[PDB]
Structure 1
Amino acid sequence: LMSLDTALNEMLSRVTPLTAQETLPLVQCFGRILASDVVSPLDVPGFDNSAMDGYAVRLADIASGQPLPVAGKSFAGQPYHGEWPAGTCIRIMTGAPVPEGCEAVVMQEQTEQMDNGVRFTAEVRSGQNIRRRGEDISAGAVVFPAGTRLTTAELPVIASLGIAEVPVIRKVRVALFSTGDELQLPGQPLGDGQIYDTNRLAVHLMLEQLGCEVINLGIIRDDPHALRAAFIEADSQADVVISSGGVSVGEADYTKTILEELGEIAFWKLAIKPGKPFAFGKLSNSWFCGLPGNPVSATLTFYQLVQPLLAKLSGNTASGLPARQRVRTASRLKKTPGRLDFQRGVLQRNADGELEVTTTGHQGWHIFSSFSLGNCFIVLERDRGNVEVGEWVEVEPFNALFG
């Protein structure tokens, strides 16, 4: 019934980003969200300097149309600090500080040289090949705004301005547990109708990879007291508590009564596939997400719903999900109207060098192998029925959470 779009915007609208902060040395900042703007302490470049290697000149002497002899020279960090006789020109090398009153720079290949003067060529427009102090970054200006996810793209710039540490928002804290007498820990023996817990592992690797501090409270026993206890501990030290399975997502039962007792939880029926149910709301001091038991529904719900909510909590201003792109199917896809279907497929180059998707295989939720064989989702529009080789289709490549 309810649409992904609707639920996303209902979730994100209620959430307020964190703002607690700490200050760390740059080498510890990868993935972290700058808490305040970074402002440039210095000019960059720090003085007007030469774009090309060649000759520094006064627009005056260029109308002499007569060789100009080299009075002197200015290199890397050995400026020309002297008299500039009229009718002459300076040899200059890139990164080198222009000389006092220089009006332009000419690449030497645009000026045939000589053994007694420098003969120029194509008119020398003013300012040409001069990089003006603060042209790249002007001191006092805003290099990188608050809310930016720091990376190799940004951290090295910050180091270049001489800054050793920046303020970042604290890592989001998420608490995590599963429940059900059916669940068994790995290495323990599979009882009667029992299965090994996988969703909690799955939710844990993703949280850790998205940068959160995880608090894994393990498998809670099937008891209303064990369970209340677990929520009280989860809520007291996370911004977010996640049930990777077993807690209710709609079906009437005792977990559903503990959840209704401990906060405002809505139970949504999303029009997605795989999946459907998903639980969400406020507890006392945290937000609650509850996932379906199905490994495929869980993984998927977490990735399209929780992932973006953690993004926002983190202070991050960019939406933290990859962009989609339009690509040709190379496989007949089965898709039934009514539902936004996140199938998995494989994005690869054809002979022509253009991009095409193939289905992974069966898209049923009774397996996990689609996540490995795949490398993206084929996001079939809600109303679309079947698709034939060659139709167009939106594709959303997986991120680092899946390889």
Structure 2
Amino acid sequence: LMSLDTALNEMLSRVTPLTAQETLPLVQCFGRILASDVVSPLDVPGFDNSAMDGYAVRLADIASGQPLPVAGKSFAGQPYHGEWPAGTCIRIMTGAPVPEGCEAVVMQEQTEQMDNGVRFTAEVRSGQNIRRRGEDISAGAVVFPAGTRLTTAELPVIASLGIAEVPVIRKVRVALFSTGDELQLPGQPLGDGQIYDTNRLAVHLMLEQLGCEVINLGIIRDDPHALRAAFIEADSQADVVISSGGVSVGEADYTKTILEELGEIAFWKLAIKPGKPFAFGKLSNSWFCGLPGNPVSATLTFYQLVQPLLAKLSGNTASGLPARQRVRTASRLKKTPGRLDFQRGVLQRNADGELEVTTTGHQGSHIFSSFSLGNCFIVLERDRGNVEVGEWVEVEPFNALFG
């Protein structure tokens, strides 16, 4: 019944971005959120310089319509600090500081030389080919705003300004655990109607990849006290606590009563597929997210619900989810109205070089293979029914969490 958009907004609207911070050397800043604006301490370039290599001139002598002889020259880091006779021009090479009083620079290709004077050609519009100091970055200016996720794109720029460290928001801390007597650890023998715990591993990997500090409390035994203990501990050192499975997401049982006892938890029924149930609310000092037991369902719910909440909490101003794009289906897709279906597909280039999607196969949640075989989500609109080969469809490519 409830819609993804609704739950998402309801979730993000209640959360307050972290503000605690620490200062680290650039090399340790990948994926981190800048705590404050980065203001440039210097100008870049620090002085007016040549856009092309050619000739530095004064709009005056260009009226002579006669050859201008090179009085001097200015290169890389060897400016021309000398007298500039009238009617003459300076030989200059890109990045080189324009000469005192230079009104324009001309690319030699736009000026046939001579063995006695430089003949110009196309009029020389003022300021042509002159990069003015602070044109790129002017001292005092804001280079990168707070809330920016530092990447290979920004850190080297910050280093170019001479800064060795920057304040970043502390990593988000997340407590993780599962519960259920039927859950067994890898390496351990499978009991009667037992199964190996897999959701927890899934959530742990994603959290780490998302840059969070993970606190894995393991499998909690089916006991009212063990569970309460687990929650008290999780809430005490994490901003968010996640149940990868076992704790109630609606159904009645002791886990449900412990949840209601320890916080304000809502039990939503999202109109999505796979999945539907999701637990969300506030514990004493953390946010709680409860995932359904089904592997496909938990992964999907975490990826579309928890991920965005972690992005906001982190201080990051960009919506930490990939963008969608319209593409054509090359597979008939089975879809039932009433739920927003996040099917898995395979985005690929066709013969004509265009992008099309193929289903990964069976979309049932009884298997996990679709995540490996696919590379995207074919997000089918809630109201839509079956889709025929050739129809337009929305696609959301997987991010680094899946390859």
User: TM-score normalised to the size of structure 1?
Assistant: 1.00
1-structure distance, mates of 2:78, 2:186: 68
2-structure distance, mates of 1:49, 1:136: 12
Q: For structure 1, list consecutive stretches of 5 or more residues without a partner in the other structure.
A: none
Cα offset, 1:349, TM superposition: 0.2
1:214 aligns to what SS in structure 2?
A: strand
2-structure distance, mates of 1:79, 1:120: 23
Cα offset, 1:60, TM superposition: 0.2
2-structure distance, mates of 1:321, 1:86: 62
Cα offset, 1:375, TM superposition: 0.1
Cα offset, 1:43, TM superposition: 0.4
2-structure distance, mates of 1:263, 1:191: 34
2-structure distance, mates of 1:121, 1:115: 17
Cα offset, 1:41, TM superposition: 0.2
2-structure distance, mates of 1:274, 1:112: 70
Aligned to 2:167: 167
Cα offset, 1:321, TM superposition: 0.2
1:59 aligns to what SS in structure 2?
A: coil
Cα-to-partner distance string for 1:121-175 (whole Å, 9 max, x where unaligned):
0000000000000001010000000000000000000000000000000000000
Alignment of 1:265-280 (within 5 A): 265-280=265-280
2-structure distance, mates of 1:208, 1:314: 14
1-structure distance, mates of 2:327, 2:213: 37
Q: For structure 2, list consecutive stretches of 5 or more residues without a partner in the other structure.
A: none
Cα offset, 1:213, TM superposition: 0.1
2:61 aligns to what SS in structure 1?
A: helix
Aligned to 1:6: 6
Cα offset, 1:40, TM superposition: 0.2
Aligned to 2:316: 316
2-structure distance, mates of 1:106, 1:223: 82
1:249 aligns to what SS in structure 2?
A: coil
Cα offset, 1:54, TM superposition: 0.2
2-structure distance, mates of 1:258, 1:351: 57
Cα-to-partner distance string for 1:252-298 (whole Å, 9 max, x where unaligned):
00000000000000000000000000000000000000000000000
1-structure distance, mates of 2:305, 2:293: 16
Cα offset, 1:303, TM superposition: 0.2
Cα offset, 1:80, TM superposition: 0.2
1-structure distance, mates of 2:382, 2:5: 12
1:312 aligns to what SS in structure 2?
A: helix
Aligned to 1:117: 117
Cα offset, 1:205, TM superposition: 0.1
Give the fraction of aligned pairs with identical amino acids, expressed as a percent: 100
Cα offset, 1:361, TM superposition: 0.2
2:60 aligns to what SS in structure 1?
A: helix
Cα-to-partner distance string for 1:95-139 (whole Å, 9 max, x where unaligned):
000000000000000000000000000000000000000001010
Cα offset, 1:233, TM superposition: 0.3
2-structure distance, mates of 1:368, 1:46: 56
1-structure distance, mates of 2:73, 2:291: 71
Cα offset, 1:237, TM superposition: 0.1
1-structure distance, mates of 2:87, 2:309: 67
2:364 aligns to what SS in structure 1?
A: coil
1:309 aligns to what SS in structure 2?
A: helix
Cα-to-partner distance string for 1:174-223 (whole Å, 9 max, x where unaligned):
00000000000000000000000000000000000000000000000000
Aligned to 1:348: 348
2-structure distance, mates of 1:42, 1:356: 48
User: TM-score normalised to the size of structure 2?
Assistant: 1.00
Cα-to-partner distance string for 1:68-107 (whole Å, 9 max, x where unaligned):
0000000100100010000000000000000000000000
1-structure distance, mates of 2:3, 2:79: 66
Aligned to 1:190: 190
Cα-to-partner distance string for 1:286-329 (whole Å, 9 max, x where unaligned):
00000000000000000000000000000000000000000000
2-structure distance, mates of 1:123, 1:351: 49
2-structure distance, mates of 1:332, 1:107: 59
Aligned to 2:297: 297
2-structure distance, mates of 1:204, 1:79: 58
1-structure distance, mates of 2:280, 2:306: 10
Cα offset, 1:379, TM superposition: 0.1
Aligned to 2:141: 141
Cα offset, 1:243, TM superposition: 0.1
Cα offset, 1:13, TM superposition: 0.1
2-structure distance, mates of 1:274, 1:40: 48
1-structure distance, mates of 2:372, 2:69: 69
1-structure distance, mates of 2:361, 2:272: 19
2:258 aligns to what SS in structure 1?
A: helix
Cα-to-partner distance string for 1:327-384 (whole Å, 9 max, x where unaligned):
0000000000000000000000000001000000000000000000000000000000
1:341 aligns to what SS in structure 2?
A: strand
Q: How many residues are treated as equivalent by the alignment? A: 403
2-structure distance, mates of 1:311, 1:261: 28
Cα offset, 1:396, TM superposition: 0.1
1-structure distance, mates of 2:398, 2:155: 25
2-structure distance, mates of 1:134, 1:330: 52
2-structure distance, mates of 1:326, 1:135: 39
Cα offset, 1:63, TM superposition: 0.4
2-structure distance, mates of 1:402, 1:136: 38
2:105 aligns to what SS in structure 1?
A: strand
